[PDB]
Write a protein that binds this ligand. Structure first.
Ligand SMILES: N=[N+]=NC[C@H]1O[C@@H](n2c(SCC(=O)O)nc3c(N)ncnc32)[C@H](O)[C@@H]1O
Length: 336
């Protein structure tokens, strides 16, 4: 068995000549002796913590059912032949050169690249929502790119089925997804069970593609909202009246009036069409926030918009021991 930086990689014999990439998991590249190409392989060791088992089952179940050019596929899954012997799971994927988080650390994107990246994000997200699934953790590091700038959404560990009938909750309720990309209703009255929470994160991603800096880099839970309101300004009477929870409404009413900051003042080099779509994704009221199919038809994406080339899903959509059993069952098709 080949090893890489301490831990081992029981991926032989089909996958050889491993190389570290990054890091209860770990990712390396490997040579696929069957297909004669180098691939990506991530090792997952989740079975002692149930929250890890949850993320693993969600990711595997969803990605095995999804097939889309802008969503990372699972080509293979390696694991022990029995439940007792299964400690680790290996997910094999197409090899990508980088991700958008790493690329934004050092590279200035041209408007052509920004436009092409955004189109691909929304084309993939269109498929996800057509399956009645919410990603719930979209961010630059979950967008993979290869050497010809093909983009694929990855990491579905927090994804769930949309449930807008049960989205309402109290003020300041606990949340899991990545802070800088959370919509304002998360901190006020929403469990994040509707499609609008993904669109907000994509808006945050567009803004970050425009300046190589996160637009709302909150340092803690409620600080996230202060950042969002410092740029969007105070919510209108109509948006406030849609918030019936008294604690959340009275918090917003307790704030001093704040003016909206113009997008063209924040991003003076940006294309005006990109800023118009930005505004519609980063809308405060989630019922007014643009949807993914509307975003694809925005003039900014006119060079690429082709609804017959933007396919949708055919088939839309517990303790540690059952989850490990279900992961074993879900991966049996690649045995062996
Ligand atoms: N895990 N982790 N972090 C370590 C590193 O993995 C990198 N990476 C992932 S990570 C997918 C996921 O997050 O599920 N997939 C791939 C892939 N197909 N090809 C190349 N690189 C990948 C990601 O760029 C980060 O640098």
């Amino acid at each position: 068995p080949e090893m890489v930086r301490g831990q081992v990689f029981d991926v032989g014999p089909r996958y050889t000549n491993l190389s570290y990439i990054g890091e209860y998991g770990m990712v390396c590249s490997a040579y696929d002796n069957l297909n004669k190409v180098r691939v990506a392989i991530k090792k997952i060791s989740p079975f002692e913590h149930q929250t890890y088992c949850q993320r693993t089952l969600r990711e595997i179940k969803i990605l095995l059912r999804f097939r889309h050019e802008n969503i990372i596929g699972i080509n293979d899954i390696i694991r022990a032949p029995t439940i007792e012997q299964m400690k680790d799971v290996y997910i094999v994927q197409d090899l990508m050169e980088t991700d958008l988080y790493k690329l934004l650390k050092t590279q200035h994107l041209s408007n052509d690249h920004i436009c092409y990246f955004l189109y691909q994000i929304l084309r993939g997200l269109k498929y996800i929502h057509s399956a009645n699934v919410l990603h719930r953790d979209l961010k630059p590091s979950n967008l993979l790119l290869n050497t010809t700038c093909d983009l694929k959404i990855c990491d579905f560990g927090l994804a769930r089925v949309a449930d807008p009938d049960h989205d309402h909750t109290g003020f300041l309720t606990e949340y899991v997804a990545t802070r800088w990309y959370r919509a304002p209703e998360i901190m006020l009255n929403s469990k994040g069970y509707t499609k609008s929470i993904d669109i907000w994160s994509v808006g945050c991603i567009l803004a970050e593609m425009l300046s190589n800096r996160p637009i709302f880099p909150g340092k803690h839970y409620l600080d996230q909202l202060n950042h969002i309101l410092g740029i969007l300004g105070s919510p209108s009477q109509e948006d406030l009246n849609c918030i019936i929870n008294l604690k959340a409404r009275n918090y917003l009413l307790s704030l001093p009036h704040k003016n909206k900051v113009p997008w063209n003042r924040l991003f003076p080099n940006a294309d005006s069409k990109a800023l118009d779509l930005l505004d519609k994704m980063l809308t405060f009221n989630p019922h007014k926030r643009i949807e993914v199919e509307q975003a694809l038809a925005h003039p900014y994406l006119e060079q690429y918009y082709d609804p017959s080339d933007e396919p949708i899903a055919e088939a839309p959509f517990l303790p540690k021991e059952k989850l490990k059993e279900l992961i074993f069952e879900e991966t049996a098709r690649f045995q062996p």
